[model samples]
Structures are given as C-alpha cells and as structure tokens.
Target: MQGGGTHSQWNKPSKPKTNMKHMAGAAAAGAVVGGLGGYMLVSAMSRPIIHFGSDYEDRYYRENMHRYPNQVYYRPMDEYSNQNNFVHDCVNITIKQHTVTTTTKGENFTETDVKMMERVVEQMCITQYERESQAYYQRGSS
Candidate 1:
C-alpha cells in the first residue's frame, strides 16, 4: 500500500506547479500561431517568400517530378518577392534531364540557385526507389 502512494505521487505531475514546461509549449505553439505575421514580414523584406528553402524544397521536388521533369518552370513572383535559393536547383534539374541549357539568367538571379534544384533531382532519385520496389514485387508473380 505504501508503494502505491509513491507511484501516485509521480503521476500527479499534473499539478500546475512547475509551469516551466507549460511556458515552453505555449511559446512554441504561439510562435507558429502568428505565422502570417512572420510570413508577411519576410515578404515585405528584400527577400520575400520566406519559406525555409531547406524543408519545402524537398517536398516540392518529391511531388513535382513529372511536372518538373522537362523544363524548369521558374515563374518566380515579381520583383517584390525575390527568388529563393530553390530556383537555382530548378535550372540544374533541366541540365540533369540531359536537356540543353544556357545562361537562362536574362533577369535577376545568382548562380547559387543550383543547389536547390539538385534536391529536386535528389527527390527524383527517391522516386526511383519506389518504382524499383514495384518492379521487385512484380517479380514475385514470376
């Protein structure tokens, strides 16, 4: 019976004491809750479209394979929104597809953008794994 009391004490961390954890969680959630505040703010700045190029770039390439497999449709937003580093990769994707490429930099862009497109191609490689798995399973029938 005494040991039961000890276990119950540990479970009662439910008490409002040590609200330190609560503060951290509330701040984390609140930080994202005002998402538009930061989104609009970044857009207003010289570099608009403040997505973390690191994260979204992966997904964009993952899903947009067929769409981007050919030419890179770099329809960047107007001058108000600067091109993200991801567009750099968009051009590189075309190169890897073995399509002819040139200094497509008629307008504003730095050469550093290729890294972003590299990830797009990287995602394409990921898709290869899936397709290969399908072929593997199809062999089971044989």
Candidate 2:
C-alpha cells in the first residue's frame, strides 16, 4: 500500500508551485497567446495589396498585327557579344508596327530622342514573355 502511494505520487503531476519553472511555463503560454492575438489584429487591419505592371508594347503589337500585313514582326533582341561589337537593338515597337520612313526632309525625333527610344524597347522586351505566351496560346493547339 505504501509503495502504491509512492508510485501514484511519481505518476501524477505535482501542483504548479510558484517557482522559476512555473513562471517560465506561464511566460511561454502567454507569449503564444499574445502572438496569436497580435497576428489576428494585424490580419484584420491589413489593406488589400495593390500590384502594377506594364505590357503595353505587347498589347499594341497583338492589336495591330493585321494593320501591316506585309511587314514582318521581329522579336525584341536579347543577346550580347561585346560593347563595340554591335550597336544596341532599338525596339521602337510602337512606331515599328505602324510607322518607319525617312525622307531626309522631315523628322519627328532627334538623334538623342531616338537613343531614348531604344531603351523603351528594351524595357518592353522585359515584360514581353507573358504577352508572347498569351498570343501563342490564343492561336489554338500550339
């Protein structure tokens, strides 16, 4: 009977005495509860995230493919060998599809403005992947 009492004493958890262990356990529980409460508060107060992007060049191309049926559509350039090897690939996608003529008498853009146009082309190429993919899929059965 005495041995049974000793075994029961060992099996049952002792009362939560006021000690470092109890304090640490309470602190850990409090931290978990506090963390959960904080997360819920932030989630409730958070705003809807807004995202912005560009694919205007691609959009323009797809829309105007039929307008210039004779003109060939060139993929935006993406390769390099050396700086002096070749000049940068100018996109001019907006004008390329619908406009490009030199009479040597009248000009809309200056030399510097043309250089800036090349950069706009490069920027368009960056977002062209998705636009191209959408076009290809629209054709049906690859």
Candidate 3:
C-alpha cells in the first residue's frame, strides 16, 4: 500500500545524443590536416623537375639511346655541379661540373614506353581512387 501511493510512470534514460560540438571540432581538425597534406604535396612538386635529361645528344646518339643501356640515374641539384647553368629539358643534359652522367633507361620510354607510361598512370589513378574511397568510409564511421 505504501509503495502504491508513491508509484508513478518511469522513463528509461536515453543514450546521450551524438555530440554536435565534438563533431564540429573533429571537422576543424580534419581541415587543418588536409591543409597540411596539401602543403606537403605542393612542397614535393615544387622541387626542381626530375626530367631524365642527359647527354644523349651526340656521343650517346642512337634510337634506343632514348632508353640508355647503362644504369638509370637521378641527380639532385646539389649533386649537379653545373646547377648555375640554364639547362633545357633536353634528352641529354651535361653535368660538366660534376663530370657525372645521369640517365633513365631509354627502354622505359621507347615507342613502347608510351603504352607503359599510360599503364603506370592508370595504376596510380586506381590506387588514388581506392585510397580516397577508404578515407570516405573512415569518415562515415566517425
């Protein structure tokens, strides 16, 4: 009887609502990270172009010379002694300062290289798309 007098309807407590404020903060953080990522990408691209230019002009002349028979080489501006000279994106660039030669396998860019390059580009594009898709899925989970 005593309990009946005090008895009343009861409601189950609800789970806390998704915190909008926290979501907003997360979004701001993501924006900052995205900006930083973009900056990093720009920094990477801003570096001097890495054209596989070399001295394939005269002494290395050959149809296949477009793809060198020797080892592929990549040189940084610091390693390039003639960094002060104006160099075109010529197939052959002289590194007279260092007396070094850099080359990319001409075989990689022969008439067949175009198709290979296209396939490489396609592979990169597919990987990029997959990465983006994963990112979106991750965001949705949050």
Candidate 4:
C-alpha cells in the first residue's frame, strides 16, 4: 500500500567529465613552453651575418645542419667579407671587425684559411650535385 501511494520514477545522474580537463591542462603547458622556445630561436638567429657564415661547418651546429648554411658558397671570398661590413644584418659591421669572429686557430682569413673554406664548399656542392642528379634519374614515373 505504501509503495503504490509514494513510489515514483527516479532519473539517473549525468556522468562527470575527466579527459577534457586533462587535455586543456596539457595544451596550456605547451603554450608556455612553445613561447619560451620561440624566444630562444629568435635570440639565436639575430647574430651577425659573418657569424652565420662561419657557423656552417658540419657537425658543429647539429646533425641537421653545419656551422654553415644550406646554400652554395658561390659568393667570392671578398664579397662575403663585405657581408660583415655592409648593413646586410648586423650592428656596425666592418671588414676588420667581421673577420675576427670566424677565424680558426684565432687566425684571420688571408686566402690561407679562405682558400680552404672555398674548397670545403666545393666539396659539399660537388657531393650534393651528384646525389641530386642520381635522384633525378632514379624516378620511375614517366
């Protein structure tokens, strides 16, 4: 008798969410870390142009790049030295001031070391050219 008089249908409670909270937490952490990393990269790239030239030596920069960069060293040795002097991208650069930073054995580029750099560039470009030609020939698509 009591059941018939008082009993009624009960609604189930909605489920609480958990995974969305974790996803947003991870994304927030990534935002801070990504901002910090971009600041560091911008700081590094803001170096003098000649500094960029000297850095292209293989293995010094990282496995991905050399102390040098990814372009052929076609510019004459003199033209590149002027890169430091010109306002290409640096703070008050000049020929004498630019050469000081990229010296090996703390020595200047006197065609002694410079000739060596040119040959090094030649070696890299030769290898790159050969490989690219082979890559062109290897494609099977007509």
Local distance difference test scores for all models = 0.33, 0.33, 0.26, 0.30
**Reference-based lDDT, residue 8, model 1:** 26
Q: In model 3, where is the ten-residue run with the lowest total lDDT?
A: 97-106
- The parts of candidate 2 lying over 4 Å away from their true place are 1-99, 108-111, 134-142
TM-scores of all candidate predictions against the true structure: 0.29, 0.25, 0.24, 0.27
* Predicted candidate 1 versus true structure: per-residue lDDT over 29-84, tens digit per residue: 33322111121111111111212256555455435344332332222232222134
The alpha-carbon lDDT assigned to residue 50 of candidate 2 equals: 17
Off by over 4 Å in 3: 1-109
Candidate 4 runs further than 4 Å off: 1-107, 140-142
In angstroms, give how far residue 117 of model 1 lies from its true place: 0.8
lDDT of 2 by residue, 1-142 (tens): 1222212222233453333312344455433221111211111111121121334343443343343211222345434333322322323443342232221222344454443334443344333444555666678451
For model 3, residues 1-142, the per-residue Cα lDDT tens digits are 2111111112113543233322443455333221111211111111111222333322333343333222112232221222122122211211111111111111123444333323222333233334445666678543
lDDT of candidate 2 vs native? 0.33
Point out the worst 10-residue segment of candidate 1 by lDDT: 39-48
TM-score between candidate 3 and the true structure: 0.24
| Residue 117, candidate 4: alpha-carbon lDDT | 36
Q: Please, what are the lDDT tens digits per residue for candidate 4 over residues 70-107?
A: 23312222222232223222221112222322322233
Of the pair 2 and 4, which is ahead by lDDT? 2
